[PDB]
Amino acid sequence: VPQTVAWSAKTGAVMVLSNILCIVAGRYVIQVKSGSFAGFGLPELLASTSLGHIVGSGAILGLSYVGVL
Amino acid sequence: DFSAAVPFLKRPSNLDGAYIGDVGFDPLGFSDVFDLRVLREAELKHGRFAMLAVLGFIVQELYTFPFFPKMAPVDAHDYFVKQGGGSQIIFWISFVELFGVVALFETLQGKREPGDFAFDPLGLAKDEATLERYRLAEVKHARLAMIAIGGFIHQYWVTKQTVLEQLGNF
Amino acid sequence: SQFIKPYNDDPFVGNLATPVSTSSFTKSLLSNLPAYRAGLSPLLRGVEIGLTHGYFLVGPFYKLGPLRNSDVALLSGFFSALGLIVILVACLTIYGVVSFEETEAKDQLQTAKGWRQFTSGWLVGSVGGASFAYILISNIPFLQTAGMSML
Amino acid sequence: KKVSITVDRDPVATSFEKWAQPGHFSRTLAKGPKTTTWIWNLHADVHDFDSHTNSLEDISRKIFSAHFGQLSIIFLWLSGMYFHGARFSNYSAWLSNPTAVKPSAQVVWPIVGQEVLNGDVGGGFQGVQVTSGFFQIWRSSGITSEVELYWCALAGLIMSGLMIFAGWFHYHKAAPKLEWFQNAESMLNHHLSGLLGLGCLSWAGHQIHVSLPVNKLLDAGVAPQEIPLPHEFLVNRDLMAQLYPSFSKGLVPFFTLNWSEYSDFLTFKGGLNPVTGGLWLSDTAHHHLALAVLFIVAGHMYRTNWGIGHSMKEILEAHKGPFTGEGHKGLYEILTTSWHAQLAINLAMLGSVSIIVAHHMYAMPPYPYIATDYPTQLSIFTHHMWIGGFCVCGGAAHAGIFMVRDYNPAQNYNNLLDRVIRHRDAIISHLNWICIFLGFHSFGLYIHNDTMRALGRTQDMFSDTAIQLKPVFAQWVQSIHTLAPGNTTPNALATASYAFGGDVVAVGNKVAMMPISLGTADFMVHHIHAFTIHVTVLILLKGVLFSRNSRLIPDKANLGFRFPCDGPGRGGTCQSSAWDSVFLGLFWMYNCISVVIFHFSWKMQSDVWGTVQSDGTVTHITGGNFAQSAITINGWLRDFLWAQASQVIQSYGSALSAYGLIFLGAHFIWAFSLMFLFSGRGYWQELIESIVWAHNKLNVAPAIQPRALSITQGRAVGLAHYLLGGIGTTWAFFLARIISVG
Amino acid sequence: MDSNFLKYLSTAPVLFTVWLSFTASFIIEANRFFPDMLYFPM
Amino acid sequence: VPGDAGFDPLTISAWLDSRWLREAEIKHCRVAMLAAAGCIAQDIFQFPGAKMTALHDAAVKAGSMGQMLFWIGFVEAISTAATIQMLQGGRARMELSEIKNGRLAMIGFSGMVHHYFITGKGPIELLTS
Ligand code: CLA
Ligand code: CLA
Ligand code: CLA
Ligand code: CLA
Ligand SMILES: CC1=C(C#C/C(C)=C/C=C/C(C)=C/C=C/C=C(C)/C=C/C=C(\C)C#CC2=C(C)C[C@@H](O)CC2(C)C)C(C)(C)C[C@H](O)C1
Ligand SMILES: CC1=C(C#C/C(C)=C/C=C/C(C)=C/C=C/C=C(C)/C=C/C=C(C)/C=C/C2=C(C)CCCC2(C)C)C(C)(C)C[C@H](O)C1
């Protein structure tokens, strides 16, 4: 079984990082919608944090698997 | 615009107060889908069954016929399932309900009020005004007895005491 | 960029120019092949095709034939290949007789004389190729086995 | 907000008037019958909605309400299976002793001596043995009571009433407009996220909270009435944490992403449960939870009302290369304006999924005690092969209907359809060649082996003892899947299926699953499969590609999808329609699926199913005769059909005598079909003329003039009786054989 | 009762299924009470 | 319109109906007001013969929570009819006062339940200790 850990500030760091990474990515790549103050709506934010949680969870589970944590 | 009973709900389109006992109460919108005539047929039939049953409870605790064993009304349901008198009552109800099917066809064809069987042997209804007053009373009693019989059977299921003995005890 | 076009710049012809049908590699291979080679005599066309076909016919008859487990497997395989060559050369002969009306010109396969020259070349090539396969398999032990001689 | 709900209110009046006028839906049929052909033409075109109305809106409304009617029928059917399990079954007796009691949920009335069909299935019970696998489903659900089966029957009944109400409501009260139906992005988002995703999520939740505790208690050995009721696991988290100690921590490990705490009940074990011979339900719970996450995530792909998402039109129009012209341009317009194009795709996919279901369910038995209930394993494999094959041929049927009717060349210039129709001779000629090559090199190997074995030349055969056609690629893939646990699936503990190699799983001394070795006979029958699938594709594809026109008939689209011919000229154009290729390909589907179920039945009896003796020896049902006898046709005739038809033929006077009767009855129906298949309408019309004369003589001629069936209907009736007869023969043969011996 | 629903119940498949179910039903009932009638008893 | 401090930083009002949002806010307000008044009341006094979250768990066994759920569910079904109809189709000061007090009670109850998770104490107990 892959080794996962209880929540720590490092897990929080990975989630926060992945979320911000996806906010910036969503500002660049979402085709239908002041770098972040132009056309930034709730759907765009909600979609990017949805992916940020998907990417963050995948990253946390993988970095816990390999030992990086 | 809005319902007399529920102030914040709008009055159902099919409920115009033509049927006595109407207060606009139909939130789930069963009258927007189904024929109100059929629904008033069903309301009065369920209520008349319930009124006869609540009097059925009360009299059956107070008295029972000497040829039948003394026992509780739900036990009476099971005894008359196994004895044959339940099948008798079911047959005669079903026999009357055949002409009830004919009566409901008369209602659907527009030629009969939903609860009218012209059953006034004792001539208690004198004119239209008292008939309307009695009719509102009948629907109110019908609805109240539907809730009451559910209470009597459910209370017996929870506490194995009859309605008169449950008032007498506790 | 479109890699499929109408064949011969004619849209209503019943073919499509495609990479498989009309690449330069396909055109080079067909032209190089003896049947379509320019400058090749019909007899010479038959000799090259025959040498090829007779050479590879011996192997399935030899390796998978009824007499394969016998020591006469190669002789049986050659004879079976030779018999198939004689049946096929009869087929070539009868096709030539019925298909082509007799004409003086022999420079093409699609002529009575040209198909007769082709059949002549195919028989000589096929018997020679079958014989060449027999000589090679008999001499080389590895060819006698299925490649398991090393094992 | 361009994705919106739009409905016409009270479109169609709920009246019995059109019920009383049969044929009301078409202008041809509404003027009444003059010949008996009208009667047949009534049923033949009833569900052909786009033949009655021009408007796509009324067509879509009719389809939506007919889908609710179908769902109502399925829910009524399910409610009946639950009620027959509750009332007319030995389910409670089967729960106590799953390996000895035979499932039975059907009891016959004693009327004409037919009460012999109430055989002794076990558990103090007499009834017809049932093979649908419902008992194993219910044990997997954790039902453990007939009362809960009554509640499931009522839940099915309520759903059946709600679907028939919804079909009435959505046709007659609030029918959606066409712009509602043409929301493929919204529908896909909801059917991936909501239908499949919350379906898996809710089912995984049920498995974790109900199936897992009840089945752990059942496999521990606790009697079904000693097991706590399924809500007592929901409330008493302490009692649930006894069985699975991870429940002591609750939902904090889920949200904090500490998911390895849940490894008690969300496993990746693989293999089978040794007690039941079924899949580990902890694996199934993890499986459904993982599918739920991806299905919900997938249902966020498409753009609906907020700018995030894909336009499927943009995805399709961007995929074009140098070989394929304009590419997938115009396919979105097709699939949101043609119902038949959607039905062609979805029927081919539903059939493919049903075929995948049959292979995966036998190999990885998913229910407790289903692997060693061999009548159920054979029944559900054979059933889902037939549902798969039928649905695949209906995918080609509605591809033909799309091509004949909904295809417009103006909107399909130089796209993928245009290019396929413009090289259909190359497609059909190469498919024709591969089918000839593969009939020669699969069935001709059988003819070679028949000949050599008949000639005394056993050294000249394709066999394991002679020339060995080994399936090296299939054996190699089996090697990889046996080596996969700990190597390429490191966190797996066992193989995905024991069919690939590994242990023999035995339950109640009967083999649940065991390695299926592949030899020369398996190479030969798999290339038989590749051949029969290829030829069925050739007939169905040749019908789709040549539905609109040929070199033979240049205006075939003007004759329609379903026409009998265009006369005896051009040499004869009998069966030139796309319909007649569906007609001819349903025979080849029948041929394909019949060989698949025969291969499965013989291979599982010969090499998988049987009893485990002391020292782990497995005595198989037909004793390993597949390897040396499935290489000849005489072996299939002798050692499979003749040897195993013993049970149907000798079933009279027993509980399996119904199978003997259906065996004979279906041989009858199959033969009776050939009257419609080998004959033509003109014979029967002249014979009917003489019979009409005999009626005229007695002044008893009918006013609806009797006609011989149409040419197409004679073909359809012949095919329907042929399929019923063949499949019913195989159904009776399979079921009596495996109920007796397995 | 509605005349169009009665005209629907007068249609050929409904009457055929009801009449042959009634026919089947009294063959079943006659073979229930009086089974095994291979002959007219005399 | 009531309780409008111009506070919609994520702009929820742009992407959901202001009537559905206001119904949710007012229903959350009222429920939270009853809940917050309830939290302090349980510690202050107990109805004769009778924990922020554990008492809920005890009550479901006694059926006290179950009876409350059924009756609240019936009123809520009528409320669902009201919400659908609203979406389909002195006192001013009091509406603002109800919204502000309800928002304060939402935070209030939220504080009380997290206080219970922390010290295992009721809100009056938190003031006492
Ligand atoms: C949907 C699936 C399904 C299936 C295949 C069956 C099949 C069966 N059931 Mg089960 N059943 C089901 C659902 C199902 N049932 C459901 C949902 C319930 C709960 C209500 C039941 C409850 C039930 C009981 C309680 C019993 C059965 C029994 C039976 C058996 C005989 C029934 C019979 O002869 O009726 C024949 C009854 C007739 C009245 C004859 C039918 C003739 C008429 C004309 C039918 C025509 C339909 C009509 C023409 C359609 C058009 C309508 C009209 C307006 C035109 C048979 C094995 C019996 C059994 O197993 O005994 C051991 C039994 O006692 N069933
Ligand atoms: C998330 C929402 C959702 C869900 C669950 C469904 C579900 C379904 N749709 Mg779809 N649909 C949706 C949104 C949704 N749709 C939208 C937004 C549109 C507009 C673009 C459509 C347009 C559409 C069309 C045009 C068609 C469907 C069809 C179907 C049915 C497919 C047959 C099947 O597998 O049913 C069996 C599976 C089931 C689960 C049966 C359950 C039935 C109910 C309706 C499921 C949901 C119940 C409820 C939400 C669950 C509450 C849970 C509670 C107990 C806690 C299925 C009931 C087809 C159909 O058969 O029509 C009836 C069809 O033709 N839908
Ligand atoms: C989701 C599945 C689905 C759907 C919605 C449709 C829908 C449609 N199909 Mg398609 N089709 C399907 C599956 C489907 N089919 C499959 C699986 C096949 C392969 C067999 C076909 C083959 C097919 C052809 C070849 C044709 C259609 C046609 C039609 C249309 C009208 C059919 C009609 O009125 O028949 C009304 C229904 C009947 C006449 C029922 C009779 C069918 C059999 C004989 C009854 C089965 C009885 C039972 C199962 C076994 C007998 C038991 C016995 C012992 C009593 C309609 C658009 C026809 C059409 O008009 O094209 C536009 C047409 O030509 N389809
Ligand atoms: C058992 C009976 C039988 C046989 C042998 C065939 C044979 C064939 N069918 Mg037919 N078919 C049959 C029944 C049969 N069909 C029935 C009942 C239907 C009902 C609908 C159809 C409908 C049908 C359609 C609709 C299609 C076929 C196709 C085919 C061909 C498949 C390609 C192939 O395998 O070539 C290999 C040839 C064989 C397997 C024949 C057996 C030969 C064996 C191997 C030995 C050869 C003997 C050898 C020549 C001896 C020479 C010496 C001698 C001459 C003296 C082939 C000609 C397809 C086709 O032609 O396209 C490719 C096609 O599309 N069939
Ligand atoms: C067996 C036996 C005997 C007997 C007996 C008999 C025959 C007893 C018959 C009993 C009957 C028929 C009871 C009928 C109950 C109906 C009810 C309670 C309806 C509730 C509906 C509600 C509250 C509503 C509503 C709705 C409205 C209107 C508007 C909607 O938009 C919304 C909404 C859904 C809210 C007796 C007892 C004498 C004793 C004997 O020894 C044995
Ligand atoms: C099983 C079985 C048996 C049986 C039986 C029978 C006949 C059982 C009958 C059960 C019944 C009638 C249940 C219904 C009760 C009424 C309810 C719940 C409505 C309450 C009012 C509500 C919710 C709201 C009211 C509202 C409020 C707030 C106040 C204002 C009004 C309103 C707005 C409407 C036997 C005896 C035959 C024995 C045998 O063993 C078989």
Ligand SMILES: CC1=C(C/C=C(\C)CCC[C@H](C)CCC[C@H](C)CCCC(C)C)C(=O)c2ccccc2C1=O
């Ligand atoms: C027998 C036969 C007929 C005559 C068959 C007819 C006229 C069918 C009439 C049978 C009776 C009248 C009704 C059939 C009823 C069955 C007992 C069951 C039918 C089940 C469904 C029809 C409901 C054809 O018309 C025909 C046409 C083209 C190719 C082959 C044939 C063919 O073989």
